[PDB]
Structure 1
Amino acid sequence: EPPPMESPFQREDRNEPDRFDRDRLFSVVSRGVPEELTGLLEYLRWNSKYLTDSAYTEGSTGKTCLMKAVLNLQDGVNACIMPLLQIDKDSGNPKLLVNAQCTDEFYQGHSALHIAIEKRSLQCVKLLVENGADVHLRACGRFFQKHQGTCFYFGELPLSLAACTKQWDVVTYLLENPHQPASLEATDSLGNTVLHALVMIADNSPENSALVIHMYDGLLQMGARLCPTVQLEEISNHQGLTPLKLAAKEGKIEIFRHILQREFSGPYQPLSRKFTEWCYGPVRVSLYDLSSVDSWEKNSVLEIIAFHCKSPNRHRMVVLEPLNKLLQEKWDRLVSRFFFNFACYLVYMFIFTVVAYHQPSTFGESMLLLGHILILLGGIYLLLGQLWYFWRRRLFIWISFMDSYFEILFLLQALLTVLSQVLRFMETEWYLPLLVLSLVLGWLNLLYYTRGFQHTGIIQKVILRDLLRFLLVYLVFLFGFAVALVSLSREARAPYRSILDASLELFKFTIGMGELAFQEQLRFRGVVLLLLLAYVLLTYVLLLNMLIALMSETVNHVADNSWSIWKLQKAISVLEMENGYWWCRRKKHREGRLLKVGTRGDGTPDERWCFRVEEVNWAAWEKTLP
């Protein structure tokens, strides 16, 4: 169990001048009395000891006497801190007490500078920095990593801590101080910078959204003065994700929207990504930057949202501009291919149906033999196509089954089609069950192409989740009653002769596919009637609770995301159509036009691949009219 950081009720673990031990020293710095610190310096020199030794620190974690004073801050100032640092200098300690860190697994790298920032004591922050505090210390402990349970991930940096805790006075002091300035490009163990740390702590709540966005813009403007040449937003972590890409993967849509469309007028203009071109009444025309957004570049935001995002807001991020117009233009260019692929699959299903319809148990046989070849070649083409898709997008289908359940069905139909034609060559009779199942699955796969139509493309998740929940209860009811009916029939000896036949008989009656046999000739026909009556009544109550649970969830949860999901379905489709087929791959066409926005910080003309978006909103226009 991790020890507490500061417990006023639990003593710290312990794992000729008068004696001044750790217990006496920890008590003095806790009460903030510099008068009783006398005698510590004479003790250290007498036995050649230092304040950073293991005797003066908690053995379990490594908390020093200096951090005890910072934890016990009285109205922002501790009178014991300044004498404590002076004793360390006079004692000749090779390692500075100010830069001391813990060694515990839970608290690793935690120093006194981290505590002073969290306690919101700028006077304590200035006092430590003036004495030689390193501002580039990493708190790489389990408590400071993002995981389940008790944790606080602030970026593992003192500068990142002040930004996440909304302390602009501490951020300003650390960034520009004569003693030791803080760089905005500092990275933690995960490679996250200060801007990367903000998107991780960001939340869709309006309070946290206002905190992170205001902190994000302030650091960019301050970073433009301290480091004009360095582009802070193009820095990537160990996963290769920029702060724009990192917000897309995690799903922080509120900051993702702000970064995607931001506009700064006058000064700090090159820090903006949306530039207004012209407006005429309700019509507003803006140029959106397509840097790291367009699908032409590798690992773009459009690919991350559609194939690397697990957040439930992925269908709302494809609606924000310029992602709405960009995916619409890509769909309009590839709408002809989508129906061309639908036409080729429909012709393949037509040939598949006719051959299976007209096969025996020489022009007619020669054309039938030619038909079997086209089925086999079509099956392998669908087989190789889905394996290529499965090799590139193995993780997307595992995290999103509802978005790509047809991809598994296209493989299964392809596997059954190829293997049936192989079994046909082996002259076995088992090619027929595989042929009719691929015929059913082949025709049922035509519903995938309904997303191209706006009426048919534009609830089911709730249904499937509840069906598997109540299926387990029904199987217990199905298995329990089936065994008793067989055991009652096997003894006094047939509709109930085995568990498989009894479970099938009861299941067919439930779905209205058959009837129940009462076993009137059996001696215990009353017991069978009692068991069959119990099964029917328990099933009705079980189905009644299923309808009530489905009724309560859909009525209470009111949401209209049919349009947003449909745009996401097109987004996943158009991104895969841009890659092309497996046998031939197209060359990606870059979207946007290279326009010179202005002058960058380094003096180079700020040329970006802007994308023109035209928006007409009468509601917002009438509000701004005097």
Structure 2
Amino acid sequence: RFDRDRLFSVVSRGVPEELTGLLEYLRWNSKYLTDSAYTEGSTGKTCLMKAVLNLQDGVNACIMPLLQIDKDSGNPKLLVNAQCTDEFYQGHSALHIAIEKRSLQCVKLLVENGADVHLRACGRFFQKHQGTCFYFGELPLSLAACTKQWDVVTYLLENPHQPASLEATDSLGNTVLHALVMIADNSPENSALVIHMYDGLLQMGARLCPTVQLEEISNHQGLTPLKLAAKEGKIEIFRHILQREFSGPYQPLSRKFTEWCYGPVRVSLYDLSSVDSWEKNSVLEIIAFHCKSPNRHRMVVLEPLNKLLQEKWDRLVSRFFFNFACYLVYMFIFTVVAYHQPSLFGESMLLLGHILILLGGIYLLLGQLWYFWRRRLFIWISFMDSYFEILFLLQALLTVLSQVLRFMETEWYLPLLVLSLVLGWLNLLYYTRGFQHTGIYSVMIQKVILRDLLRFLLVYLVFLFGFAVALVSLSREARPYRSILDASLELFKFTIGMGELAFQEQLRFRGVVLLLLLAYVLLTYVLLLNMLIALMSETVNHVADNSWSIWKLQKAISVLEMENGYWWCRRKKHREGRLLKVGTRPDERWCFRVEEVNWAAWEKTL
């Protein structure tokens, strides 16, 4: 008969001779092995995929005659180029099976018979998402690289039948170098092997694609492999690309060039092409504003980024402290006008003070609306650590609202003016990042306590409200606690040490009211004891202090904002480093010179 269920059971056994007569049946019916009648249910999976899933000692003897049988059947849609068609496995092919099963012998046999090396396995199983998936890029070459198969990578790249283009891209526009950056994990076993796989593909690009800058190829997000390593927070492959140095044929593939070395001292030129904030959507802008990861503070402390951000900071520290001094003068005027308010020359100076506060409030409102307009595409990333950018917008809104309510003469202007005065001085703590000692301490102090106190507050407020409605209900009968607010406040005073715990003489149920207070005190102090010990257990872990690097990231975010100037006076950006000849491409690049002194590393080479 040679129906599908015979053919699929035949090719699974690995015996080629049981195919005898399949040619005659296909020709007599006028059918093809890639028509729906020869496919597995709820997909497009063919007899060739069924054959390649069942390799014996690295090969299946049915593949060569099955491919002739298709070739002799006169098929317009060849069996090697047929793909799965359902929403999960769309574009999956026998060549992607052959590569995942690690058979170079089967990859050769398929490609020799004209299997298209550029087929994209693009269905949802092969996309990157939080469910069950396996992203490898989408192409045979990207699969061979991510499964660590040099011999298959070499064969796909330089076979005579159909060479894999190193310029080829998946549905996201990712090249094999973006795919390797997507698949990097920051563990020493993954990252070292991804670094080798990346370097050998880049070195092969210099043979196979000699005029093509493979690391200047952009995906559909506009990211090169280096920019993608920053956005995805992949420190190990990021550090490797950023600091890469080679000798001999591959020197132009370097980003770092040693200029001289003498004793413990190395002087190196680093290539700033994608890196300097003079370029829009550069690596520094990405780490600061487009990267989601915990790793951002570890990325700004790498060379050249560390010395490059110190060089920018030193050019801007006088602008940082000028901006602080204007804000001190604004907060002095705010305070001298919030104090000296009238009952609700000195009078015209008070009016001047209100106009200066209105103008400083509009200036800050426009400056923060410009920040959130520029940061629109990544707006949550641009405030998740940078909470002051919201608190300056809030202080400016409340400053404009309070002057508006004062022009309306409604007395609710004063509690808004006083709230924006408090926020105004709390916002003065932003500038503590300008010095190492205060700026590292502002990073030591604020932590995981903000996450867990918001969890404890639910337990504390169910206790506080549950006991407040009870003490109010029971203190109603005669032989404190007058309302839900007053009982919540008397019960809250026990946590500030002002409890007023007593056997109330006039209440009918005074012993039960005292037992309700003793129940609240004991339960609340057990809860506070559980809360402090829970916080110590997570936060006193011995992890080495990462505050210097989180402060270096705060200074990086500050620099990359200051380089634009102000919303009204948009600064022309200076370009870092020098245009220097590093070799023959000549190979002239904006290089930045770093000098490293390292006795501890150098003495180990003696």
In the aligned structure 2, how far is the partner of 1:481 from the partner of 1:572? Answer: 47
Q: Give the equivalent residue in structure 1 for 2:55.
A: 73
TM-score for the superposition, normalised by structure 1 = 0.94
Q: What's the CA shift string for 1:514-551, capped at 9, x where partnerless?
A: 53576442212222222211111111111111111111
CA contact (8 A) 1:505 1:516 kept: no
In the aligned structure 2, how far is the partner of 1:274 from the partner of 1:289? Answer: 6
Tell me how far 1:512 sits from its aligned partner. 3.0
In the aligned structure 1, how far is the partner of 2:436 from the partner of 2:144? Answer: 49
Tell me how far 1:428 sits from its aligned partner. 1.8
Q: What's the CA shift string for 1:392-429, capped at 9, x where partnerless?
A: 12465523655211111112211222222222222221
In the aligned structure 1, how far is the partner of 2:181 from the partner of 2:332? Answer: 51
**C-alpha distance 399-516 of structure 1, shift in aligned 2 (>3 A):** farther
In the aligned structure 2, how far is the partner of 1:541 from the partner of 1:438? Answer: 37
In the aligned structure 2, how far is the partner of 1:476 from the partner of 1:48? Answer: 76
Secondary structure of the 1:268 match is: helix
1:220 to 184, 202, 215: 202
> Where do residues 28-177 of structure 1 align in structure 2 (5 Å cutoff)?
28-177=10-159
Q: Give the equivalent residue in structure 2 for 1:14.
A: none
Secondary structure of the 2:476 match is: helix
Secondary structure of the 1:182 match is: coil
Comparing 48-57 and 197-206, the one that deviates more:
48-57
CA contact (8 A) 1:506 1:516 kept: no
Q: What's the CA shift string for 1:66-89, capped at 9, x where partnerless?
A: 110100111111011111111111
Tell me how far 1:557 sits from its aligned partner. 4.6
Structure 1: tracts of 5 or more residues without a match? 1-18
In the aligned structure 2, how far is the partner of 1:422 from the partner of 1:263? Answer: 61
**C-alpha distance 539-396 of structure 1, shift in aligned 2 (>3 A):** farther
In the aligned structure 1, how far is the partner of 2:361 from the partner of 2:202? Answer: 55
Secondary structure of the 1:29 match is: helix
Secondary structure of the 1:142 match is: coil
CA contact (8 A) 2:375 2:382 kept: no
Q: What's the CA shift string for 1:293-328, capped at 9, x where partnerless?
A: 000001000000000111111000001000001000
CA contact (8 A) 1:209 1:255 kept: yes
Tell me how far 1:372 sits from its aligned partner. 1.4
CA contact (8 A) 2:16 2:62 kept: yes
In the aligned structure 2, how far is the partner of 1:214 from the partner of 1:546? Answer: 48
Tell me how far 1:62 sits from its aligned partner. 1.2
Comparing 455-464 and 222-231, the one that deviates more:
455-464
In the aligned structure 2, how far is the partner of 1:608 from the partner of 1:58? Answer: 56
Comparing 510-519 and 376-385, the one that deviates more:
510-519
Comparing 213-222 and 558-567, the one that deviates more:
558-567
Q: What's the CA shift string for 1:130-150, capped at 9, x where partnerless?
A: 111000000011111111122
Comparing 533-542 and 477-486, the one that deviates more:
477-486
In the aligned structure 2, how far is the partner of 1:76 from the partner of 1:420? Answer: 78
**C-alpha distance 259-110 of structure 1, shift in aligned 2 (>3 A):** same
In the aligned structure 1, how far is the partner of 2:548 from the partner of 2:344? Answer: 54
Identity %: 100
In the aligned structure 2, how far is the partner of 1:57 from the partner of 1:436? Answer: 74
**C-alpha distance 551-29 of structure 1, shift in aligned 2 (>3 A):** same
CA contact (8 A) 2:475 2:509 kept: no
CA contact (8 A) 1:191 1:238 kept: yes
TM-score for the superposition, normalised by structure 2 = 0.97
**C-alpha distance 570-127 of structure 1, shift in aligned 2 (>3 A):** same
Secondary structure of the 1:169 match is: helix
Comparing 137-146 and 365-374, the one that deviates more:
365-374
Tell me how far 1:513 sits from its aligned partner. 5.0
Comparing 497-506 and 77-86, the one that deviates more:
497-506
Q: Give the equivalent residue in structure 1 for 2:456.
A: 470
In the aligned structure 2, how far is the partner of 1:542 from the partner of 1:599? Answer: 70
2:413 to 431, 435, 457: 431
CA RMSD of superposed structures (Å): 1.7
**C-alpha distance 402-507 of structure 1, shift in aligned 2 (>3 A):** farther
Number of matched residues?
A: 602
In the aligned structure 2, how far is the partner of 1:606 from the partner of 1:107? Answer: 45
> Where do residues 310-349 of structure 1 align in structure 2 (5 Å cutoff)?
310-349=292-331
Q: Give the equivalent residue in structure 2 for 1:552.
A: 537
In the aligned structure 2, how far is the partner of 1:510 from the partner of 1:362? Answer: 35
In the aligned structure 2, how far is the partner of 1:76 from the partner of 1:70? Answer: 10
In the aligned structure 2, how far is the partner of 1:311 from the partner of 1:486? Answer: 49
CA contact (8 A) 1:310 1:400 kept: no
Tell me how far 1:59 sits from its aligned partner. 2.9
Q: Give the equivalent residue in structure 2 for 1:528.
A: 513
Secondary structure of the 1:360 match is: coil
In the aligned structure 2, how far is the partner of 1:463 from the partner of 1:401? Answer: 19
CA contact (8 A) 2:383 2:389 kept: no
In the aligned structure 2, how far is the partner of 1:400 from the partner of 1:595? Answer: 35
CA contact (8 A) 1:102 1:108 kept: yes
Tell me how far 1:508 sits from its aligned partner. 2.7
Comparing 210-219 and 144-153, the one that deviates more:
144-153
Matched, 1:507 2:492: yes
Comparing 138-147 and 550-559, the one that deviates more:
550-559
In the aligned structure 1, how far is the partner of 2:40 from the partner of 2:47? Answer: 9
CA contact (8 A) 1:402 1:461 kept: no
Secondary structure of the 1:110 match is: coil
CA contact (8 A) 1:397 1:404 kept: no
CA contact (8 A) 1:483 1:499 kept: yes
Comparing 369-378 and 292-301, the one that deviates more:
369-378
Q: What's the CA shift string for 1:333-354, capped at 9, x where partnerless?
A: 0010111111111111111111
Tell me how far 1:254 sits from its aligned partner. 0.1
CA contact (8 A) 1:379 1:417 kept: yes
In the aligned structure 2, how far is the partner of 1:460 from the partner of 1:379? Answer: 28
Comparing 506-515 and 220-229, the one that deviates more:
506-515
Comparing 143-152 and 311-320, the one that deviates more:
143-152
Comparing 304-313 and 614-623, the one that deviates more:
614-623
Secondary structure of the 1:278 match is: strand
CA contact (8 A) 1:235 1:242 kept: yes
